[PDB]
Amino acid sequence: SLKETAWSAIIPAFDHAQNLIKIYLKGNAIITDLHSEAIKDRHWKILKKRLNTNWIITELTLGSIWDSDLARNENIYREVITAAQGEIALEEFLKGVREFWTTLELDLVNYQRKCKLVRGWDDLFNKLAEHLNSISAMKMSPYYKVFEEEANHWDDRLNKVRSLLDVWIDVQRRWVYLEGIFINQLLPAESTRFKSINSEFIAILKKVSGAPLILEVLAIERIQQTMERLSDLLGKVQKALGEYLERQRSAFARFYFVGDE
Amino acid sequence: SWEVYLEAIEQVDNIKSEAHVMDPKAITKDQLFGSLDLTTREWTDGLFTATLRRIIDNVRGESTKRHWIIFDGDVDPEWVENLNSLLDDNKLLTLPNGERLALPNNVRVMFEVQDLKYATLATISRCGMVWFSEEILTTQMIFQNYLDTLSNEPFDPQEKEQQKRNENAIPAGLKVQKECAAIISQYFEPGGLVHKVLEDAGQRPHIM
Amino acid sequence: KRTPSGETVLRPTQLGKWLVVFCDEINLPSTDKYGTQRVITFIRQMVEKGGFWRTSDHTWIKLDKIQFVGACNPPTDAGRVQLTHRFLRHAPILLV
C-alpha cells in the first residue's frame, strides 16, 4: 500500500523482505530530504535522466523511488539533494534583494513648501554594497548557473541605482546651499543660470514625489544624464559664487574676517 | 533655598516668580540646545533654547514676571560652552542656525550641583556662586522638619484632598500620625536616641 | 494622559496598577567622559522632581503610578560604578 501512496501523499524469502524493508528504512533519510521545499521540478527531471528512468513526475509513489536502488543509487540522489539545497540558499538570497528593492520608496522629507528631498542616503549605499558584493560572490558558486540571469539583472540595475544616487546626493547638496541665496540683482548672470536649474530640479523632484519607487525613478528619461547635467551646472554656479566673494573680499579686506555665510 | 527665595521675592515686589528646572544631562546635548536637520538644514530647538525663546516671545505674558531657568544636575564644559556668551557680558545665546536669542533683564540662569570635578576656571569664572555646606542643614532641622510634616501632612492623597476642600468650604489618618508625632518626638530632640544612633551608624562601614 | 489641570502624565496602561521597573544591574551603566551615568540622573529626576521632559515637544511629564526597584553587586566588584549621591538619597538600601 505504501508503494501506492503518491508524493504530495507520503510523509517522512523472509530475510528478503526483512532486508528490503531494512534498506527502505536506511534510505528513508533521502525520502525526507527528497520531500523538502528545496526539491523543485528541475531536480526531479535531473533525477529522471541521471537514473535513465521513464516516469512522469506528476504521478509519483514511494514505489516509483524505491524502484531504483535507493542504497545503490543514494549517490546520485545525494548529488541532487545537495545541488537543490545549494540552489535554494541563493534563490532565498534573491528573495531578499527582490523583496527589498521591488517595493522600496525613497525616503522623502518636506523642504519649506518647495518640494521634498531624498533622505536615507547611506542606508541605501550599505544595502547597495551588501547586495552588490554578495551578488558578485554568489557568482563563484557551484550553483550560480540557474539564477545567473537575474544575478546579472540586479547587478546592472543596482549599479545604475548606485550611480544614480551618487550624482544625486551631489545635486541636492549643491542645491540646498545655493537655493537659499537665490543679490539676484547683484549677480544676474548666475541668478538666471540658477533659476533654470531650480526649475527642472523642482520639476524632476515632483515626478519623484509622484512615484517614489527608487526602481521607478531609475527609469526616468535619461535622469542619469540629467542629474549629471544638473550637478555640472550647479558646480559651475558654486564656483561662480566663490570668485564673487573672493572679489567682495579683496575689495574690502575686513571681509576676510567674516565667513562665507 | 531658591524655592524659598523664589516664592518670597515674588511677595515683596508683588511679581510672579517662575522656575523652569531641568536635568541638563538627563537628556542629550542636542535635545538640550537643539540641532540642525542633515538634509533640510532646518534648525529645531533644544529644551533650553525653547524655554528661553518662550520668554523672549511674550505671547503668554512672560514679560509680566521674573523667570529662573534652572539646571538641576551635573556640569561639564561640553554642555556649557554653548552658554558662555550668554553669561559673560553680552547676554546673547548664539545658536548654530545663527539666530542668536537675547537674554531679557527679567531672566536668571542658575545651576544646582553637588560637585565641580569637571568644571573649568573658564566655565566657573563667568558665574556668581553660593556654596551650601552640608553643615548648614542640621540633623536636628531635619528631624524637626520631619515631625512637622508627619503631624501636618496626611499619608493619604485622598485625605489631603478631603482636607483642602474642607478648608475651601483632621481625617482619621492624620489624627493617628499626630499622635505618633507625639510618642516619638522625644527620641529626636538633642542628644537623643535617633541622634546617638545615627552618629554610630555613620562611623560604621556600609556596602555603599 | 493630559490631566484636567492641563498637565500631561505618564501612567501604566494597565487599569489600577503601579508599574514596577526592576533594574537588575543598576550600577553597571557606564559614565561619560565626565563621570555622569545619565540613566541615573534621569531616574533621580523622575523620583525627586516627579517626572521628566519629553524632548520631542518639550512637555514635562509627571509619572502617575510608576516606581523603580534596583538590585546589583557592591561597587567593589569589577564594572560596578559607585552611584551618585544625589541618587542614593532616594534609594533605601538592604544588604542581602
Swiss-Prot record, chain C:
Source organism superkingdom: Eukaryota
UniProt subcellular location: Cytoplasm, Cytoskeleton
Parts of the chain that traverse the membrane: none
Record's subunit section: Consists of at least two heavy chains and a number of intermediate and light chains.
Comment text on domains: Dynein heavy chains probably consist of an N-terminal stem (which binds cargo and interacts with other dynein components), and the head or motor domain. The motor contains six tandemly-linked AAA domains in the head, which form a ring. A stalk-like structure (formed by two of the coiled coil domains) protrudes between AAA 4 and AAA 5 and terminates in a microtubule-binding site. A seventh domain may also contribute to this ring; it is not clear whether the N-terminus or the C-terminus forms this extra domain.
Family: Belongs to the dynein heavy chain family.
Function according to Swiss-Prot or TrEMBL: Cytoplasmic dynein acts as a motor for the intracellular retrograde motility of vesicles and organelles along microtubules. Dynein has ATPase activity; the force-producing power stroke is thought to occur on release of ADP.
Protein name: Dynein heavy chain, cytoplasmic
Organism encoding this protein: Dictyostelium discoideum (Social amoeba)
Portion of the parent chain present: 2721 to 2816 of 4730
